[PDB]
Amino acid sequence: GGTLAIQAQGDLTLAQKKIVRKTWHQLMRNKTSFVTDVFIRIFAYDPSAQNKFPQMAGMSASQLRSSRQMQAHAIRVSSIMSEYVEELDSDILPELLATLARTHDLNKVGADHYNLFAKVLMEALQAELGSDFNEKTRDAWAKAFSVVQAVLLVKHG
């Protein structure tokens, strides 16, 4: 696999950068439990995604929302996300995603879990922005999702 491996150079055009940080912060700011609520949706649409987290597999949304493991996974998504959104520096991505990638591959979380995540956050963004989710917003975000997508999973040993 791993065509072109790691390179990336100057990733997104500045206008895409301006709009992906602004919107991530709009959402983070205005919707307090945003990231957990994204996970609580993924599990509705894809019940096996619940199963990759063995212990909580089989719980209802209300006792899903108060799980030490759910909350801790969610703020960890939250911090990797805010770390990148700070500068959208394409190549501090390699060390950021490095352990994530290994533990995800160990619990068999892959490509259709990342895809799903992207769909559900895309949705959240649109519920937030309204009619002013005018397509630069969608493109910049997909491009961001591609930069990130490009260098994910396994070389786990």
| Residues lying near ligand HEM in the complex (CB under 6 A) | 49, 52-53, 73, 76-77, 80, 99-100, 103-104, 107, 109, 113, 117
Sign of the torsion angle spanned by Cα atoms 124, 50, 116, 11: positive
On whether 104 is known to bind a ligand per the annotation, the reply is yes
CB nearer to ligand HEM: give 19 or 153: 153
On whether 25 is known to bind a ligand per the annotation, the reply is no
| Closest distance of CB 49 from ligand HEM, Å | 4
CB nearer to ligand HEM: give 21 or 104: 104
Phi, psi of 151 (to 5 degrees): -125, 60
Asked if 48 and 104 touch (Cβ cutoff 8 Å), the reply is no
Candidates 32, 47, 39, 34; CA nearest to 64 is 39
Based on its alpha-carbon atoms, the radius of gyration of the chain, rounded to whole angstroms, reads 16
| Closest distance of CB 112 from ligand HEM, Å | 9
| Closest distance of CB 122 from ligand HEM, Å | 12
| Closest distance of CB 131 from ligand HEM, Å | 27
Residue 126 CA to residue 152 CA, distance in Å, equals: 26
Binding site: which residues?
73, 104
Binding site for heme b: which residues?
73, 104
